[PDB]
Amino acid sequence: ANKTVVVTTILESPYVMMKKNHEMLEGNERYEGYCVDLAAEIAKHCGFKYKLTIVGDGKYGARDEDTKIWNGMVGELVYGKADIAIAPLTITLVREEVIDFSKPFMSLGISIMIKKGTPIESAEDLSKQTEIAYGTLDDGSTKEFFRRSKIAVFDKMWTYMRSAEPSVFVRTTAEGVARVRKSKGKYAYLLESTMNEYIEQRKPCDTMKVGGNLDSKGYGIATPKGSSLGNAVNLAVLKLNEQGLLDKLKNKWWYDKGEC
């Protein structure tokens, strides 16, 4: 007996955003974005009806070291609050151990965002000075990257961030960007290339991505371990990428609406 699939996602531009006129709209129609379009495509190919829901705690997903409880979208899947996650959720080892991921629908890497004019061009540069503070998003894969990294440069950076005060970590990507823009160049933000490049093309056009990506990874559609939707979803992602649909959606939400 087919039932409506509960999709957990997160408000993160340009993946999922509230339409300007969202208040006069209902259900899935309230949202727009890359992942909204992707959800529709996946549902079509897999043949299911769905309901988009914004993750309760607004987080991507990390495990509490003391209680071992998962939060964010990962947690909603782990505890059965959602049937699938369609968002810019990074495929990682610790997550793959508790939930399933489709092959990546988008490739990306950690990058550096600076306020135009900031004397910084690489991660090494950030590590060799103190005047400019830098941080990452909380409960995300970027923070985890620096925590599980043995690489000398990334180790030094983590040592700084982990004990830096005031806290250099932010609750949302939006908070990180706002901090860069109002820091007069005294704050650099570490975020995924995908978001960095998006913001770079948005007014007031005062930020820019610098240096090469620190790593190479991807986002995947996630389902609870052993879910019957996993197989179809995985094949759907491959089909969409091969048809060029994923590439079309990328341009549609990143550069076609560019305002810089």
Ligand X SMILES: N[C@@H](CCC(=O)O)C(=O)O
- Spatial contact of 190 and 135, defined as CB atoms under 8 Å apart: yes
- State the residue for tokens 């897999």: 46
Q: Which stretch binds a second copy (CB under 8 A): 41-49, 53-61, 72-80, 230-238?
A: 230-238
- Spatial contact of 201 and 207, defined as CB atoms under 8 Å apart: no
What is the Cα–Cα distance from 212 to 179, expressed in whole angstroms? 22
Choice between 103 and 252, CB closer to a second copy: 103
Query: Least distance (Å) from Zn ion to the CB of residue 68?
Result: 9
What is the Cα–Cα distance from 115 to 180, expressed in whole angstroms? 6
* Residue 66 sits in the site that holds Zn ion (CB under 5 A): yes
60 Cβ neighbours under 8 A, 6+ residues apart: 10, 72, 73, 74, 87, 89, 90, 137, 139, 140, 141
Q: Which of 171, 183, 170, 177 is nearest to 204 (CA)?
A: 177
Restricted to residues 79-108, the positions that interact with ligand X (CB under 6 A) are 88-90
* Residue 215 sits in the site that holds a second copy (CB under 8 A): yes
Q: Which stretch binds a second copy (CB under 8 A): 36-44, 46-54, 77-85, 242-250?
A: 242-250
Could you tell which of a second copy, Zn ion, ligand X, none binds residue 238, using a CB distance below 5 to 8 A set by kind? Answer: a second copy
Q: What amino acid occupies position 43? A: A
Query: Least distance (Å) from a second copy to the CB of residue 215?
Result: 7
Q: Is 162 annotated as a binding residue?
A: no
Query: Least distance (Å) from ligand X to the CB of residue 219?
Result: 6
* Residue 140 sits in the site that holds ligand X (CB under 6 A): yes
Q: How would you class 23 by CB atoms within 10 Å of its CB: exposed for 0-12, middle for 13-18, buried for 19 or more?
A: exposed
* Residue 64 sits in the site that holds Zn ion (CB under 5 A): yes
3-state secondary structure of 69: coil
How many residues bind a second copy, per CB under 8 A? 29
How many residues bind ligand X, per CB under 6 A? 10
* Residue 224 sits in the site that holds ligand X (CB under 6 A): no
Query: Read out DSSP for 10-66?
Result: --BTTTBEE-TTGGG--GGGGEESHHHHHHHHHHHHHT--EEEEE-TT-----B-TT
- Per-residue contact string for residues 176-215; x = within reach of ligand X by CB under 6 A: ---------------xx-----------------------
Dihedral sign for Cα 157, 163, 169, 171, please: positive
Q: Is 104 annotated as a binding residue?
A: no
Q: By CB under 8 A, name the one of 122, 172, 227, 241 that touches a second copy.
A: 241
Query: Least distance (Å) from Zn ion to the CB of residue 38?
Result: 10
Query: Least distance (Å) from a second copy to the CB of residue 248?
Result: 10
- Which residues are part of a known binding site? 88, 90, 95, 141-142, 192
Footprint of ligand X (CB under 6 A) = 60, 88-90, 137, 140-142, 191-192
- Which residues are part of a known binding site for L-glutamate? 88, 90, 95, 141-142, 192
